[PDB]
Design a binder for this molecule. Structure first.
Ligand code: CL
Ligand code: CL
Ligand code: MG
Ligand code: MG
Ligand code: MG
Ligand code: MG
Lengths: 117, 118
């Protein structure tokens, strides 16, 4: 029962642009995605579940870094600012995985735990 | 002053700032100048770095109060504002930067499963 504001919140947390979420998750125009965030139309079940699954991936990514911190390591995390460079290192990923990687790396940098390269 | 261009972009995005908002309020520069700081074309100014680190500290303070409610077994209802003026009505001594920080905190706890958004 994700609301319009909850969709927007998770989309922003995952560092997706509207156009990226619209193209790949919604398979709709950016305008149609904006309508789900504005509440003009209900958030589709399939879109809700996909946002939740992507959040679960992000959690798995964080649990792994947490173990490195528990070991005393100060990780050097890749912050890719070029999609093509992310994809060259992750040939089976796409723009969604790129944004997830940014969200995770930014969290640990901002918390003071990791350095970005 | 050791924050890199990518670290600036990372913290700016984590705090949910649009480039234009960061440029106007934190940089006191054009959007293009802020973009140059994120792309590496121009060095990140020391004072910009410090304001961004200070904003991260503000965000930590905001999260610590929520964490204490979670420790009591509460499921908070966090306000997710999607209009600046509605945030300001409840937070009249704040600005657009404060609004974005409030979104970043509410979105974190909602996405991690601990809070509902209203
Ligand atoms: Cl609304
Ligand atoms: Cl609140
Ligand atoms: Mg691989
Ligand atoms: Mg450093
Ligand atoms: Mg206040
Ligand atoms: Mg609910």
């Amino acid at each position: 029962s994700m609301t319009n504001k909850e969709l927007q919140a998770i989309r922003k947390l995952l560092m997706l642009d509207v156009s990226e979420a619209a193209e790949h998750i919604g398979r709709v125009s950016a305008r149609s995605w904006q309508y789900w965030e504005s509440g003009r139309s209900a958030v589709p079940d399939d879109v809700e579940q996909e946002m939740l699954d992507l959040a679960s991936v992000r959690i798995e990514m964080m649990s792994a870094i947490d173990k490195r911190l528990a070991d005393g390591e100060r990780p050097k995390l890749r912050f890719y600012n070029k999609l093509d460079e992310y994809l060259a290192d992750n040939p089976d990923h796409n723009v969604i995985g790129w944004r997830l990687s940014q969200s995770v790396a930014a969290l640990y940098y901002t918390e003071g735990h990791a350095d970005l390269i």
